[PDB]
Design an enzyme around this catalytic site. Structure first.
Site, short mmCIF file in Angstrom:
data_model
loop_
_atom_site.label_atom_id
_atom_site.label_comp_id
_atom_site.label_asym_id
_atom_site.label_seq_id
_atom_site.Cartn_x
_atom_site.Cartn_y
_atom_site.Cartn_z
N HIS A 293 0.86 -1.23 0.00
CA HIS A 293 0.00 0.00 0.00
C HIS A 293 0.88 1.27 0.00
O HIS A 293 0.53 2.23 -0.67
CB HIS A 293 -1.01 0.05 1.17
CG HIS A 293 -1.83 -1.19 1.33
ND1 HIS A 293 -2.39 -1.56 2.53
CD2 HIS A 293 -2.17 -2.16 0.43
CE1 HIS A 293 -3.08 -2.69 2.35
NE2 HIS A 293 -2.93 -3.10 1.10
N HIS B 124 -9.64 -1.69 -4.08
CA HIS B 124 -8.40 -2.09 -3.29
C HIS B 124 -7.47 -3.05 -4.07
O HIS B 124 -6.27 -2.94 -4.01
CB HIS B 124 -8.76 -2.66 -1.94
CG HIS B 124 -7.59 -2.81 -1.10
ND1 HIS B 124 -6.99 -1.72 -0.47
CD2 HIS B 124 -6.76 -3.87 -0.92
CE1 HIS B 124 -5.87 -2.14 0.10
NE2 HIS B 124 -5.72 -3.43 -0.15
N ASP C 165 -3.56 -2.46 -4.74
CA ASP C 165 -2.51 -3.48 -4.55
C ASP C 165 -1.74 -3.72 -5.81
O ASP C 165 -0.55 -3.88 -5.75
CB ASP C 165 -3.11 -4.85 -4.13
CG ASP C 165 -3.58 -4.91 -2.69
OD1 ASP C 165 -3.12 -4.14 -1.81
OD2 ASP C 165 -4.42 -5.80 -2.45
N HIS D 82 -1.06 -10.96 -4.94
CA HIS D 82 0.38 -10.61 -4.86
C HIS D 82 1.35 -11.64 -5.48
O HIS D 82 2.36 -11.26 -6.13
CB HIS D 82 0.78 -10.43 -3.40
CG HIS D 82 -0.09 -9.51 -2.64
ND1 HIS D 82 -0.27 -8.17 -2.99
CD2 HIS D 82 -0.83 -9.73 -1.54
CE1 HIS D 82 -1.07 -7.61 -2.10
NE2 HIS D 82 -1.43 -8.53 -1.21
C1 LIG Z 1 -5.33 -9.03 -1.24
C2 LIG Z 1 -6.05 -8.94 0.11
C3 LIG Z 1 -7.26 -8.00 0.07
N1 LIG Z 1 -6.46 -10.34 0.36
C4 LIG Z 1 -5.09 -8.51 1.24
N2 LIG Z 1 -5.75 -8.55 2.55
C5 LIG Z 1 -4.98 -8.38 3.75
C6 LIG Z 1 -4.06 -9.60 3.97
C7 LIG Z 1 -3.89 -9.92 5.43
C8 LIG Z 1 -5.09 -9.25 6.01
C9 LIG Z 1 -5.59 -9.37 7.31
C10 LIG Z 1 -6.73 -8.62 7.66
C11 LIG Z 1 -7.29 -8.65 8.85
C12 LIG Z 1 -7.83 -8.68 9.92
C13 LIG Z 1 -8.45 -8.71 11.10
C14 LIG Z 1 -8.01 -9.47 12.16
C15 LIG Z 1 -8.74 -9.54 13.37
C16 LIG Z 1 -9.96 -8.85 13.49
C17 LIG Z 1 -10.85 -8.91 14.73
N3 LIG Z 1 -10.70 -10.24 15.40
C18 LIG Z 1 -9.91 -10.35 16.49
C19 LIG Z 1 -9.95 -11.65 16.87
N4 LIG Z 1 -10.74 -12.31 16.02
C20 LIG Z 1 -11.18 -11.47 15.13
C21 LIG Z 1 -12.04 -11.95 14.05
O1 LIG Z 1 -13.23 -11.25 14.19
C22 LIG Z 1 -10.41 -8.11 12.43
C23 LIG Z 1 -9.66 -8.06 11.26
C24 LIG Z 1 -7.32 -7.78 6.70
C25 LIG Z 1 -6.82 -7.64 5.40
C26 LIG Z 1 -5.71 -8.36 5.03
C27 LIG Z 1 -4.36 -7.17 0.92
O2 LIG Z 1 -4.90 -6.07 0.85
N5 LIG Z 1 -3.05 -7.21 0.75
O3 LIG Z 1 -2.44 -6.00 0.42
CL LIG Z 2 -2.25 -14.71 -7.06
ZN LIG Z 3 -3.92 -4.52 -0.02
#
Ligand SMILES: CC(C)(N)[C@H](N[C@@H]1CCc2cc(C#Cc3ccc(Cn4ccnc4CO)cc3)ccc21)C(=O)NO
Ligand SMILES: [Cl-]
Ligand SMILES: [Zn+2]
Ligand SMILES: [Zn+2]
Length: 300
Positions: free
Chosen positions: A79, A238, A242, A265
């Site tokens: 980002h 988004h 990326d 990615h």
């Molecule tokens: C290409 C994409 C869109 N796949 C990528 N996604 C990223 C990758 C890792 C990640 C992890 C999270 C989280 C998260 C997260 C973790 C915990 C909670 C809250 N939580 C806390 C404990 N349990 C929970 C589940 O409700 C909320 C969000 C969000 C987004 C992303 C990308 O943009 N790459 O550039």
């Molecule tokens: Cl890929």
């Molecule tokens: Zn991203």
């Protein structure tokens, strides 16, 4: 007058937390000389470790784009790189106090603001562009990433989530930067995750900094973020964001068109690697007269 290389006018600092690590991190952007490119450095280490932001230095791409040099990493570059690309920053040092770029609000908005607050400095060297000359494509299963020759810069993406939140959305968008602003239309698009994938990461002691404050969290039926989306099509925007960031690991702005289809990615980096190796498919060009150019940049 030529299209010139750009760096930062001043140093600027930001603080945040690593999406994966959950660690607080200080980021420092500094001006750099001509032909430096974007270089990351781990100023917490002794000796300080520099990692040029180039395709050759990518390690893991399973969740985010990581840079590596031996046993030292810089996680989640994409980002910040998207913001550098979107503002046409050629040359900069990116100092980090820890192993991950801060997630900020999950988009490139805070970075685009920070950079433009520092201001830009045109340098006395011609900006080099990589021009796509021949089509280059990579596929794996139903995922595809392609470069097509094009006199401009345009990025198209299509996602396909068989999921209640995405049905009946077009799930497709195209941005052509001749008419359309990276800042206004792409930069604010936040990262996103589906609940079962998030839980999986958390089970693996990852995504430790993630929350609804820096990501769009989609449960089985609904977005959980109470205040909604920044764009009707924030998810696909988004993905474009990326791609722009991952593409910038080429080390120069692109003259051509990118098209992604359910890509991420890993295929973005494979596309760069295939492009680079196919030297018949690209050339480096400069513009001694900005009026002949297929791309222009905002004032510094
Ligand atoms: C290409 C994409 C869109 N796949 C990528 N996604 C990223 C990758 C890792 C990640 C992890 C999270 C989280 C998260 C997260 C973790 C915990 C909670 C809250 N939580 C806390 C404990 N349990 C929970 C589940 O409700 C909320 C969000 C969000 C987004 C992303 C990308 O943009 N790459 O550039
Ligand atoms: Cl890929
Ligand atoms: Zn991203
Ligand atoms: Zn959980």
């Amino acid at each position: 007058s030529m299209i010139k290389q750009r760096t930062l006018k001043n140093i600027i600092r930001a603080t945040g937390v690593g999406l994966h690590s959950g660690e607080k991190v200080y980021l420092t952007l500094k001006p750099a000389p001509v032909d430096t490119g974007i270089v990351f450095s781990r100023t917490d280490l002794d000796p300080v470790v520099e990692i040029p932001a180039r395709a050759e230095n990518v390690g893991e791409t399973t969740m985010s784009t990581t840079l590596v040099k031996g046993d030292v990493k810089v996680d989640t570059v994409e980002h910040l790189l998207s913001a550098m690309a979107g503002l046409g920053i050629d040359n900069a040092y990116v100092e980090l106090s820890a192993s991950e770029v801060p997630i900020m609000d999950g988009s490139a908005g805070p970075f685009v603001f920070l950079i433009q607050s520092a201001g830009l400095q045109e340098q006395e060297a011609a900006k080099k562009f990589i021009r796509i000359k021949r089509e280059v494509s990579v596929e794996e299963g139903d995922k595809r990433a392609v470069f097509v020759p094009f006199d401009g810069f345009k990025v198209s993406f299509e996602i396909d989530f068989d999921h209640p939140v995405f049905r009946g959305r077009t799930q497709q968008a195209s941005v052509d930067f001749s008419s359309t602003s990276f800042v206004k239309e792409v930069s604010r698009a936040r990262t996103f995750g589906f609940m079962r994938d998030i839980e999986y990461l958390r089970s693996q002691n990852l995504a430790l900094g993630g929350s609804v404050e820096n990501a769009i969290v989609v449960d089985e039926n609904r977005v959980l973020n109470e205040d909604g989306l920044r764009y009707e099509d924030e998810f696909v925007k988004h993905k474009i964001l990326d791609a722009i960031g991952d593409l910038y690991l080429l080390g120069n702005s692109l003259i051509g068109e990118f098209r992604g289809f359910k890509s991420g990615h890993a295929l973005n980096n494979q596309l760069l690697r295939t492009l680079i190796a196919d030297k018949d498919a690209w050339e480096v060009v400069t513009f001694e007269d900005a009026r002949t150019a297929p791309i222009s940049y905002m004032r510094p």
